[PDB]
Short mmCIF file of N, CA, C and O in Angstrom, two decimals:
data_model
loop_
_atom_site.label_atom_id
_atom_site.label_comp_id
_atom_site.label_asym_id
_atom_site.label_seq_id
_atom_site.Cartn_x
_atom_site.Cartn_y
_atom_site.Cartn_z
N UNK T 1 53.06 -12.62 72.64
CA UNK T 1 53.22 -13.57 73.74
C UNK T 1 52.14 -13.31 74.78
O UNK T 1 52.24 -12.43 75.63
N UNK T 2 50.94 -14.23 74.63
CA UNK T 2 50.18 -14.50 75.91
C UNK T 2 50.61 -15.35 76.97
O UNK T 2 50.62 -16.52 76.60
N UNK T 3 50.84 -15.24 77.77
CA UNK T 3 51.13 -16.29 78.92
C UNK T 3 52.16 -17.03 78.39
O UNK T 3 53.28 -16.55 78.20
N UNK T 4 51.82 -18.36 78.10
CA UNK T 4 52.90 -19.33 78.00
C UNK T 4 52.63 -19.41 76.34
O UNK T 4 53.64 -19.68 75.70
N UNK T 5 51.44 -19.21 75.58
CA UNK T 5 51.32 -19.34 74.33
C UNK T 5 51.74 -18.04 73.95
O UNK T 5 52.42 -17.23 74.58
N UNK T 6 50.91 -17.92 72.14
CA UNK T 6 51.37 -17.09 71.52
C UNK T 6 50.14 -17.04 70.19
O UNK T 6 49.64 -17.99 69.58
N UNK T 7 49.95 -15.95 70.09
CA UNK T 7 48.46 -15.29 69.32
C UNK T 7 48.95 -15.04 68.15
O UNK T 7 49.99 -14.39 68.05
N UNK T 8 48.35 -15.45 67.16
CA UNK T 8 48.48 -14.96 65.42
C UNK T 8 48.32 -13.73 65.50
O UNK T 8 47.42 -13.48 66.29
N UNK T 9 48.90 -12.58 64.94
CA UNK T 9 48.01 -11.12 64.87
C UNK T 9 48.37 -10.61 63.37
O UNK T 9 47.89 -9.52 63.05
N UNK T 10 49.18 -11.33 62.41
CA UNK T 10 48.81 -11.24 60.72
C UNK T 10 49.43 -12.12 59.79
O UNK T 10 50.63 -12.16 60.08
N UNK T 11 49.32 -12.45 59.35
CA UNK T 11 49.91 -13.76 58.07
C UNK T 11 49.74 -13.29 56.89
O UNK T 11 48.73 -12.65 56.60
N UNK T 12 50.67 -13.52 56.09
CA UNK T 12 51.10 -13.34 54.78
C UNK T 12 51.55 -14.60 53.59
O UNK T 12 52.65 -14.66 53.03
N UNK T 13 50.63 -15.37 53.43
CA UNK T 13 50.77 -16.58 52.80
C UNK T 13 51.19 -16.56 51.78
O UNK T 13 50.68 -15.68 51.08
N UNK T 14 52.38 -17.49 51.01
CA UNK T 14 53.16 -17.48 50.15
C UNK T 14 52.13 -17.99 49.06
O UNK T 14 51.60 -17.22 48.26
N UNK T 15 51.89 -19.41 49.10
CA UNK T 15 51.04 -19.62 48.26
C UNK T 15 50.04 -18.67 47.53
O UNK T 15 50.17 -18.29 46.37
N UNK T 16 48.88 -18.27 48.48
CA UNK T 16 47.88 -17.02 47.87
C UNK T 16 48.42 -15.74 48.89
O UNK T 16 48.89 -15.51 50.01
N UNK T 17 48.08 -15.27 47.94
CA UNK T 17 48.36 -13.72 48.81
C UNK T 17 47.26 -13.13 49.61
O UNK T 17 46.42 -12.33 49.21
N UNK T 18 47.36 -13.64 50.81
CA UNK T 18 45.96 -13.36 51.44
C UNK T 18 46.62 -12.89 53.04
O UNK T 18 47.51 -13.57 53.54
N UNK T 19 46.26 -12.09 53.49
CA UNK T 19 46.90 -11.23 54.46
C UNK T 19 45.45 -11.10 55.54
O UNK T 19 44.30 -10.72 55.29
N UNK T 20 45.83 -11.38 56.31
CA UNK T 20 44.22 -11.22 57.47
C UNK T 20 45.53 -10.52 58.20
O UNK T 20 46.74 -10.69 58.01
N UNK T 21 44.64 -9.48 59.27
CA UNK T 21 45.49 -8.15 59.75
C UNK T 21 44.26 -8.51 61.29
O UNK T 21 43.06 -8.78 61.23
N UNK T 22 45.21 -8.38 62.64
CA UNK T 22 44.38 -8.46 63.49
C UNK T 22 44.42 -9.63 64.67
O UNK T 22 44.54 -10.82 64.36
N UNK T 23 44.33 -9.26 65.85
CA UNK T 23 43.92 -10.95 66.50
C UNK T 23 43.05 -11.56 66.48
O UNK T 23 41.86 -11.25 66.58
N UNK T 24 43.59 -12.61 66.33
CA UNK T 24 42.13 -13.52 65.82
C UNK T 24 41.10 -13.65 67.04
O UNK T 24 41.50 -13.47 68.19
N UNK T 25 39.81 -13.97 66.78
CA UNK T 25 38.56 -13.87 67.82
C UNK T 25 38.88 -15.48 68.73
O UNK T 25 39.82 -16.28 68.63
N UNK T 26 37.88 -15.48 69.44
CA UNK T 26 38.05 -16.87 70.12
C UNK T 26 37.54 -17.91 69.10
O UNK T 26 37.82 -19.10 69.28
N UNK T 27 36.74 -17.48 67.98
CA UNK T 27 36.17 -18.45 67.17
C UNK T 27 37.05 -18.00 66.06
O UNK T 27 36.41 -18.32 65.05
N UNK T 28 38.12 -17.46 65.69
CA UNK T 28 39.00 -17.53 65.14
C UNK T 28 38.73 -16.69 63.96
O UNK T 28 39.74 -16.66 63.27
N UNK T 29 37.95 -16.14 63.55
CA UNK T 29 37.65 -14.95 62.58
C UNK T 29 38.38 -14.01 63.02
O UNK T 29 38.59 -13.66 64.18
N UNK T 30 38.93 -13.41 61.61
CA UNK T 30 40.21 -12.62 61.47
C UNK T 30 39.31 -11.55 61.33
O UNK T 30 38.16 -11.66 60.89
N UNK T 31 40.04 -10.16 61.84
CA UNK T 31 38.93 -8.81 61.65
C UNK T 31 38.97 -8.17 60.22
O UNK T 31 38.06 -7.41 59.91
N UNK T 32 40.13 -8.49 59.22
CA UNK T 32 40.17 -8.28 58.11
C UNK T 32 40.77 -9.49 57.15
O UNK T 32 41.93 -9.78 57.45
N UNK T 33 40.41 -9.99 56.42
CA UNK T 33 40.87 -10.82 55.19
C UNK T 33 40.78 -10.34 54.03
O UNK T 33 39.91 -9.52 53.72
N UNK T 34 42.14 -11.02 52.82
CA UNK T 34 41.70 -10.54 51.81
C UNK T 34 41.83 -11.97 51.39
O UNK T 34 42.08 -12.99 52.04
N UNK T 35 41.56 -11.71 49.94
CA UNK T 35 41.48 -13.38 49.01
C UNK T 35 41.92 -12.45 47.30
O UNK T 35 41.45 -11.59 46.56
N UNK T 36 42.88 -13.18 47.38
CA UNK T 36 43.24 -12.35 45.26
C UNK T 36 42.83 -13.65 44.68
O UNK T 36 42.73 -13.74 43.46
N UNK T 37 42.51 -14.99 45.73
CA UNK T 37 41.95 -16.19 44.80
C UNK T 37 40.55 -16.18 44.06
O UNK T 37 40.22 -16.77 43.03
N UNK T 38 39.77 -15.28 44.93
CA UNK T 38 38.49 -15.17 44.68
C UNK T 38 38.31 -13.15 44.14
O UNK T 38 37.29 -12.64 43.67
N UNK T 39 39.39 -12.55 44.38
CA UNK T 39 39.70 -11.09 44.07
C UNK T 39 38.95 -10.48 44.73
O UNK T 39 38.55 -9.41 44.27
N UNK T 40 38.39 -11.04 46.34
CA UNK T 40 37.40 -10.19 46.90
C UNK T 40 38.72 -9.87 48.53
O UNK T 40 39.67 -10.51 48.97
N UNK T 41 37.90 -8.27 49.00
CA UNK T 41 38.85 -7.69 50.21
C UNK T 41 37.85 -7.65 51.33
O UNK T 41 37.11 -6.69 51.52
N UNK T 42 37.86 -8.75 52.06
CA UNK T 42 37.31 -8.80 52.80
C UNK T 42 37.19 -7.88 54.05
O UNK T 42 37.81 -8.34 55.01
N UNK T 43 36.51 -6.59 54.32
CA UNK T 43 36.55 -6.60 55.83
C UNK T 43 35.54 -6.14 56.40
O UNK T 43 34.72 -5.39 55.87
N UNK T 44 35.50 -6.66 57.82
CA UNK T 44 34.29 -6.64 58.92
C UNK T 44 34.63 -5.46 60.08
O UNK T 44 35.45 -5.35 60.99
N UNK T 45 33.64 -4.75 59.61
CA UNK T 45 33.54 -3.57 60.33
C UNK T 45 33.29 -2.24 59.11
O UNK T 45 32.32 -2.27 58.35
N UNK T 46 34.10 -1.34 59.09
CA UNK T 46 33.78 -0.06 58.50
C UNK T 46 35.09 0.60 57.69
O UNK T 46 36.26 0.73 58.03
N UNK T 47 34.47 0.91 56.63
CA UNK T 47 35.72 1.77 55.35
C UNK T 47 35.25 3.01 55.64
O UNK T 47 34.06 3.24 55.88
N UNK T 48 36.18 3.90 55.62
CA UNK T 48 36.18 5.41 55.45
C UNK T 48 37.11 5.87 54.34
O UNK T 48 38.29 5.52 54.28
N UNK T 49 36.43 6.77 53.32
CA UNK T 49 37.23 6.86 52.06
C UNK T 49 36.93 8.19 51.73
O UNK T 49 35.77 8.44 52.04
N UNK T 50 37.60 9.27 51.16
CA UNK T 50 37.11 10.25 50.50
C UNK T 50 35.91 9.60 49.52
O UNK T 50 34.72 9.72 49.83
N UNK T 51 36.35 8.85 48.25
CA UNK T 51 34.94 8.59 47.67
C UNK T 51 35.47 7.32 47.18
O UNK T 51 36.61 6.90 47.38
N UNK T 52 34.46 6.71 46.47
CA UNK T 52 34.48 5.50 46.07
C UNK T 52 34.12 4.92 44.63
O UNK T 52 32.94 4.70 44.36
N UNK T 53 34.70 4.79 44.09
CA UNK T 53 34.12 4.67 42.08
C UNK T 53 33.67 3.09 41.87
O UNK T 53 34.58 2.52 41.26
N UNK T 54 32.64 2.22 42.16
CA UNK T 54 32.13 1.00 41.40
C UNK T 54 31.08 0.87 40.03
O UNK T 54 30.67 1.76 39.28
N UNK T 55 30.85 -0.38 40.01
CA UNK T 55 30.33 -0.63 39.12
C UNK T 55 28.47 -1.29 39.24
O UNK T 55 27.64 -1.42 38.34
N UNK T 56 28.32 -1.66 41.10
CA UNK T 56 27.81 -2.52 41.61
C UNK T 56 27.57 -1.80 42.69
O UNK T 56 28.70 -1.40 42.97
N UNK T 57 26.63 -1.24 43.72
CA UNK T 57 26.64 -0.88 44.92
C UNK T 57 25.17 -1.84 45.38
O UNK T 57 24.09 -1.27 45.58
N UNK T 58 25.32 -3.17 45.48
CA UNK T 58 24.62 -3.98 45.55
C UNK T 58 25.06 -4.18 47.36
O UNK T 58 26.04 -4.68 47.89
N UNK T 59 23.71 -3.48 47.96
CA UNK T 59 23.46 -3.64 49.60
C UNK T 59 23.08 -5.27 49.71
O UNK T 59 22.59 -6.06 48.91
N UNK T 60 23.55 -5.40 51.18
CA UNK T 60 23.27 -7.04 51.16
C UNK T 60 23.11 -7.22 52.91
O UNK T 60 23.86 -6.56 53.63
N UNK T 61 22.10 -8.14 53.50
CA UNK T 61 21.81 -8.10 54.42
C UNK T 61 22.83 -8.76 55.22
O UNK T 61 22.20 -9.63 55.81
N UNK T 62 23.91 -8.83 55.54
CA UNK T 62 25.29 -9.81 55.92
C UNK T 62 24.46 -10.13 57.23
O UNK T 62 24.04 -11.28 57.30
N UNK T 63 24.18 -9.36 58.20
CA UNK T 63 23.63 -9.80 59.62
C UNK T 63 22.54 -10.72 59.23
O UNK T 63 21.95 -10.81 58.16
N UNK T 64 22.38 -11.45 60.47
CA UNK T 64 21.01 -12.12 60.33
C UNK T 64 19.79 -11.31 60.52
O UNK T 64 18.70 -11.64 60.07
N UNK T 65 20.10 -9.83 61.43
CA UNK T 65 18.59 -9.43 61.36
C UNK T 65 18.90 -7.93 60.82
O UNK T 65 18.10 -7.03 61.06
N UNK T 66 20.16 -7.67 60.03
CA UNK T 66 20.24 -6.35 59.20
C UNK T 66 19.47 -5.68 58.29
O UNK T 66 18.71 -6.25 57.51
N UNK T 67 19.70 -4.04 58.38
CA UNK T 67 19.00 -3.57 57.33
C UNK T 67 19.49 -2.96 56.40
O UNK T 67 19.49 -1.73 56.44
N UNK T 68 19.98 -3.56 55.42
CA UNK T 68 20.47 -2.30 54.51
C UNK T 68 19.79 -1.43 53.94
O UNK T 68 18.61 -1.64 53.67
N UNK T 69 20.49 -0.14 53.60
CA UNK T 69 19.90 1.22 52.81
C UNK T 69 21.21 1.85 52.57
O UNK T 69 21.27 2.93 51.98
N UNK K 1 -26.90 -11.68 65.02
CA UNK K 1 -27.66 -10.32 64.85
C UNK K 1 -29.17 -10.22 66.00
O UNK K 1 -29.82 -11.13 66.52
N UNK K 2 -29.28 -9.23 66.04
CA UNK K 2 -29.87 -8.66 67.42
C UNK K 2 -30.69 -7.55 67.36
O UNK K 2 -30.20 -6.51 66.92
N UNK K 3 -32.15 -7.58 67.80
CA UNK K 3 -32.81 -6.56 67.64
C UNK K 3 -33.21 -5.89 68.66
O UNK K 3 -33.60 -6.57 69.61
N UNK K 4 -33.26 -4.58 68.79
CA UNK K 4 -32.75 -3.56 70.00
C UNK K 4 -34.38 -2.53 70.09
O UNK K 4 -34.89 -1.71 69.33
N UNK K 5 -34.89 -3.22 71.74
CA UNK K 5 -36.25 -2.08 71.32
C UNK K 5 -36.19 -2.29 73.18
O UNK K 5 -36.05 -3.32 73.84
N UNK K 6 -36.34 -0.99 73.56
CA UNK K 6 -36.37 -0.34 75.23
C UNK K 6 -36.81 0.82 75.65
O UNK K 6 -37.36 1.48 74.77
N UNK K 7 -36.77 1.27 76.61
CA UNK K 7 -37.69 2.77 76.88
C UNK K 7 -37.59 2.65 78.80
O UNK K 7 -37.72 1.73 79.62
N UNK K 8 -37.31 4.04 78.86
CA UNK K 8 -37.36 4.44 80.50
C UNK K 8 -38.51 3.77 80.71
O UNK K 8 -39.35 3.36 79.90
N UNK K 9 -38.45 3.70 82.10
CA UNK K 9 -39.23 2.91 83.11
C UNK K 9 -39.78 4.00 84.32
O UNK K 9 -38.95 4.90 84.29
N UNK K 10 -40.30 4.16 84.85
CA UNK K 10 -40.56 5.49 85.50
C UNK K 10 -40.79 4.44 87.18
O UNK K 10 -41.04 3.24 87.04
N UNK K 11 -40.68 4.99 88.49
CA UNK K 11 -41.05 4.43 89.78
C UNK K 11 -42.44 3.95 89.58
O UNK K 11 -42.89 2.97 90.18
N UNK K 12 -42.96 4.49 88.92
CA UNK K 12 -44.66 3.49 88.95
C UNK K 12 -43.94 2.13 88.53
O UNK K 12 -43.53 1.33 89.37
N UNK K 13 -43.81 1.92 87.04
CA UNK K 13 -42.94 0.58 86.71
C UNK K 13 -42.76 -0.12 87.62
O UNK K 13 -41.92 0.41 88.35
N UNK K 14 -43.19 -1.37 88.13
CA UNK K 14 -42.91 -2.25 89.10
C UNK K 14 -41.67 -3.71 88.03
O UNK K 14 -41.43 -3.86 86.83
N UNK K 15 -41.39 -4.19 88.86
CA UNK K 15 -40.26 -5.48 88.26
C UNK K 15 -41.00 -6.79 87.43
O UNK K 15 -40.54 -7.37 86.45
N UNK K 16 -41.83 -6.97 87.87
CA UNK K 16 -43.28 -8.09 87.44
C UNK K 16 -43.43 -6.92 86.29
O UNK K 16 -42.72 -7.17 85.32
N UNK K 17 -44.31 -5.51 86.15
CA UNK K 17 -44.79 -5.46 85.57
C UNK K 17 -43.85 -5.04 84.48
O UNK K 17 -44.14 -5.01 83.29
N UNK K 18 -42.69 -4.74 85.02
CA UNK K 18 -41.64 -4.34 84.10
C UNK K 18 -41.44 -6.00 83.08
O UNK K 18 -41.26 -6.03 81.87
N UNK K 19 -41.53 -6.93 83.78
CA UNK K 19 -41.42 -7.98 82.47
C UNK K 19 -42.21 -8.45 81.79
O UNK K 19 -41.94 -9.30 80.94
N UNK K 20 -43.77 -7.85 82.07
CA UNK K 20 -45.18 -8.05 81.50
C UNK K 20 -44.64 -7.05 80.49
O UNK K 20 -45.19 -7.23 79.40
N UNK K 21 -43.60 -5.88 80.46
CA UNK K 21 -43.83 -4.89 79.77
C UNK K 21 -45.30 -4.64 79.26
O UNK K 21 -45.55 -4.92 78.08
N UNK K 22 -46.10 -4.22 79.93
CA UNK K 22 -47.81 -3.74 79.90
C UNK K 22 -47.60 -2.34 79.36
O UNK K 22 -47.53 -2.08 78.15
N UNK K 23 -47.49 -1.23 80.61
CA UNK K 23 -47.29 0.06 80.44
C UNK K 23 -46.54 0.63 80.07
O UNK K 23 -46.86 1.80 79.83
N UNK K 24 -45.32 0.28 79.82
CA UNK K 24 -43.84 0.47 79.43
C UNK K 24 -44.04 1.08 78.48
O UNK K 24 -43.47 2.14 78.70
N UNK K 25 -44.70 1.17 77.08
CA UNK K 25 -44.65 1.90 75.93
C UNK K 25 -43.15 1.80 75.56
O UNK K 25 -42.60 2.88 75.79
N UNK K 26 -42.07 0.63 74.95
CA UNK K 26 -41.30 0.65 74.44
C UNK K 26 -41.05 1.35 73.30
O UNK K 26 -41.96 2.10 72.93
N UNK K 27 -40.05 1.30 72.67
CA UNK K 27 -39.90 1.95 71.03
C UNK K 27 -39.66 0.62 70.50
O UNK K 27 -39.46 -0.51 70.95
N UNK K 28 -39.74 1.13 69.47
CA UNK K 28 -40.13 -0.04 68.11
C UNK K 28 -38.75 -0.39 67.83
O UNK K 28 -37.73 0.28 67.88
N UNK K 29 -39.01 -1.92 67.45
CA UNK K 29 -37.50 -2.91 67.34
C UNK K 29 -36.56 -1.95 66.41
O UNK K 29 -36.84 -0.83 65.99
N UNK K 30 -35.41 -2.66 66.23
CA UNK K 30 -34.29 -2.49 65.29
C UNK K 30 -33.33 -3.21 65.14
O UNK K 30 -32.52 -3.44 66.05
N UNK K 31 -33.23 -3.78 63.73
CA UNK K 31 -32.18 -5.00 63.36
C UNK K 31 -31.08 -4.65 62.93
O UNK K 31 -31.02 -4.14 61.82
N UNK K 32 -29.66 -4.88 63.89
CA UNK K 32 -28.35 -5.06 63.57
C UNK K 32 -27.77 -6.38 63.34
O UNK K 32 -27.95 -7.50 63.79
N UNK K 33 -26.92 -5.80 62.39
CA UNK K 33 -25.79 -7.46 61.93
C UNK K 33 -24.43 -7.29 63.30
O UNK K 33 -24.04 -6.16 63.59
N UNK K 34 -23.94 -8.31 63.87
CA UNK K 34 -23.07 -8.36 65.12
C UNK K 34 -21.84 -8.42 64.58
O UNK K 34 -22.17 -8.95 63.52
N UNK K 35 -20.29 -8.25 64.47
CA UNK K 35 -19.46 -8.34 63.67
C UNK K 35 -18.48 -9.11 63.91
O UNK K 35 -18.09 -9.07 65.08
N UNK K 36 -17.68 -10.12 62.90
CA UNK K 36 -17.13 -11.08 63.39
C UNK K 36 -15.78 -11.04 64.08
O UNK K 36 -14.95 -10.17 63.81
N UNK K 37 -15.61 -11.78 64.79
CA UNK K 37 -13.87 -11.48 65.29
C UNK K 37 -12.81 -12.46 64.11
O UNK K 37 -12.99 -13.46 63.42
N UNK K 38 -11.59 -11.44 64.40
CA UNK K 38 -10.72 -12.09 63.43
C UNK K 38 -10.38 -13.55 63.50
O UNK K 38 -10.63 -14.23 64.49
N UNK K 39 -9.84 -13.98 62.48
CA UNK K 39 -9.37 -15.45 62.25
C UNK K 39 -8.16 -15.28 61.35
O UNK K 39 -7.98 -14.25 60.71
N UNK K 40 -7.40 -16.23 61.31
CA UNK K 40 -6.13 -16.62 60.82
C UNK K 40 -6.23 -18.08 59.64
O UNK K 40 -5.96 -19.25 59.92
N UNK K 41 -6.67 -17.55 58.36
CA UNK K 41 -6.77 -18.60 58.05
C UNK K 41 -4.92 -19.66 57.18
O UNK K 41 -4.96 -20.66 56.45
N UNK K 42 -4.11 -19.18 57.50
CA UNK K 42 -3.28 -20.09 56.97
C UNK K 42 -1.97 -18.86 57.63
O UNK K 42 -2.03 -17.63 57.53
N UNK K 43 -0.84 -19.68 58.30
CA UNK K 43 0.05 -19.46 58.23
C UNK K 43 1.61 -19.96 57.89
O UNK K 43 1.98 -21.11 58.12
N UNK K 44 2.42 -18.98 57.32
CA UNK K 44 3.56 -19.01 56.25
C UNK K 44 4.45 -18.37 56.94
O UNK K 44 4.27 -17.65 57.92
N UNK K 45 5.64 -18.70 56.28
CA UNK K 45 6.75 -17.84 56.01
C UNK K 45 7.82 -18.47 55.09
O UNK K 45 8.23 -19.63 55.22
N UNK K 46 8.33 -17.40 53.91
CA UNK K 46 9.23 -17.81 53.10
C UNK K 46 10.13 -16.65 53.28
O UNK K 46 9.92 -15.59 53.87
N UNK K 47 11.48 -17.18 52.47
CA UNK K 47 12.39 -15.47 52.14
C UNK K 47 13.37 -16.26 51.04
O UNK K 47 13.49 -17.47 50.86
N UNK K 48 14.06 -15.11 50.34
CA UNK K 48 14.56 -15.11 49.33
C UNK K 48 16.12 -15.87 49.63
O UNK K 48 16.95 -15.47 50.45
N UNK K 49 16.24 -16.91 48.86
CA UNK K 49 17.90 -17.44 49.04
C UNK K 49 18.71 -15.90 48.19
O UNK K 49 18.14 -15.16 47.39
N UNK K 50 20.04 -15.77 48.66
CA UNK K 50 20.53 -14.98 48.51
C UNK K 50 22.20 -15.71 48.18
O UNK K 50 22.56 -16.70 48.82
N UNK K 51 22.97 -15.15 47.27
CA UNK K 51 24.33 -15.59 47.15
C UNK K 51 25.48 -14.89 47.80
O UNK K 51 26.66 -15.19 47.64
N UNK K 52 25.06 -14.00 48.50
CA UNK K 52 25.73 -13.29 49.62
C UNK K 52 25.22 -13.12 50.79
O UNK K 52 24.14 -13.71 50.77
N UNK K 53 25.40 -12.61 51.87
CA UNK K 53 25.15 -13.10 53.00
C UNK K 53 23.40 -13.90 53.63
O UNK K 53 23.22 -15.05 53.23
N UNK K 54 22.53 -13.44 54.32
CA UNK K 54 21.72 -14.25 55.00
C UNK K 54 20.45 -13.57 54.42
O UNK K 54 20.45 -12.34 54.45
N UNK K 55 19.03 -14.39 53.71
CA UNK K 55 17.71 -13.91 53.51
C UNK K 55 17.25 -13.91 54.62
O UNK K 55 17.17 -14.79 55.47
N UNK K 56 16.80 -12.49 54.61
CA UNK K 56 16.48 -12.22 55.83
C UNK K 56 14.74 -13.01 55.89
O UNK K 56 14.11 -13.31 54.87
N UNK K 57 14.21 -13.22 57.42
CA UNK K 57 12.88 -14.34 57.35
C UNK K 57 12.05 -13.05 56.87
O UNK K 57 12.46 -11.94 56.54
N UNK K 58 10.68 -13.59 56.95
CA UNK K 58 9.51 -12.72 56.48
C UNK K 58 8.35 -14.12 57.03
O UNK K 58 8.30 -15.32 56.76
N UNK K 59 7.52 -13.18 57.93
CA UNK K 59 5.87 -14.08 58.06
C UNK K 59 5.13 -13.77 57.20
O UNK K 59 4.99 -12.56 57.02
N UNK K 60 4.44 -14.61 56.44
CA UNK K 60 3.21 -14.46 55.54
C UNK K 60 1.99 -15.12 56.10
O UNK K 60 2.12 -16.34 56.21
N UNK K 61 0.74 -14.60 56.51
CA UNK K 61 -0.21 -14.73 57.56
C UNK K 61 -1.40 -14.09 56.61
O UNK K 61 -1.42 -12.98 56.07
N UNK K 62 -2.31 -15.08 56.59
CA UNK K 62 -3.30 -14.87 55.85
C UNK K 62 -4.69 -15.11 56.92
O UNK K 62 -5.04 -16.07 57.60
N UNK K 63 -5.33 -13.58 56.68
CA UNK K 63 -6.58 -13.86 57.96
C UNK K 63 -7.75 -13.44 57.06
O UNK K 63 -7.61 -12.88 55.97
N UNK K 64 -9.11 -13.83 57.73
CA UNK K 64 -10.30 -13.73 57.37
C UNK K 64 -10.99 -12.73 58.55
O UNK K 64 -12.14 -12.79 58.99
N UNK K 65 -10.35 -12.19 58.76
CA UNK K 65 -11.77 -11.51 60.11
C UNK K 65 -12.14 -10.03 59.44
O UNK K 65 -12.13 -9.96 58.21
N UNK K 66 -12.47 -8.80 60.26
CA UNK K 66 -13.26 -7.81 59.41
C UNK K 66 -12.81 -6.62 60.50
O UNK K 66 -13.17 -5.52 60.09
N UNK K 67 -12.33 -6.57 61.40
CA UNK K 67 -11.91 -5.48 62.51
C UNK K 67 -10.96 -4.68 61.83
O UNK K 67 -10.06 -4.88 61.02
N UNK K 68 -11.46 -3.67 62.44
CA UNK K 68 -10.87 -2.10 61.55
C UNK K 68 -9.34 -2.24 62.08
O UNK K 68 -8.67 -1.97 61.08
N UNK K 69 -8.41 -2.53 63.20
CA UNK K 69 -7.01 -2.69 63.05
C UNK K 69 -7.15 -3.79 64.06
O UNK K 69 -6.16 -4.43 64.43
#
């Protein structure tokens, strides 16, 4: 409860199972999404993991003026 | 290009006679090539489409001049 409204802060959609965790921005991007429609886990910002096992560690410039390494 | 020939002038040397160069006893010419300043002959920029986030830009600048940096 903001003021007189009221802020999304996670959804759990019946249809797809897609869970965004977070308040949403003023432009409405969720700080985490997932999608099992497309099987990708979306999130913006940073993972911390003991380790990590793929198949793909394909860096990708997401920012407009990023650098990956 | 420019050829380079001079010599001290001593207080006898007067300004008249300095441009008669009479007594002057110059040294003997010498021919240099003058060097060009840079030029830009065509400018570009492309970057790679990408299927995940943004190709990052890149200038491609093609010059003709000869200066050491």
């Amino acid at each position: 409860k903001d003021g007189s409204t009221w802020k999304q802060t996670f959804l759990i959609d019946a249809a797809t199972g897609a869970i965004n965790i977070g308040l949403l921005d003023a432009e409405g991007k969720a700080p985490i999404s997932f999608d099992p429609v497309k099987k990708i886990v979306n999130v913006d910002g940073s993972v911390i993991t003991k380790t990590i096992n793929a198949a793909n560690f394909v860096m990708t410039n997401l920012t407009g003026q990023d650098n990956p390494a | 290009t420019y050829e380079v020939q001079g010599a001290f002038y001593d207080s006898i040397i007067d300004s008249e006679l300095l441009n008669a160069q009479i007594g002057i006893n110059l040294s003997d010419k010498q021919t240099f090539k003058m060097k060009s300043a840079p030029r830009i002959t065509g400018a570009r920029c492309e970057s790679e489409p990408v299927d995940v986030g943004v190709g990052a830009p890149i200038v491609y600048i093609d010059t003709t001049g000869e200066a050491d940096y």
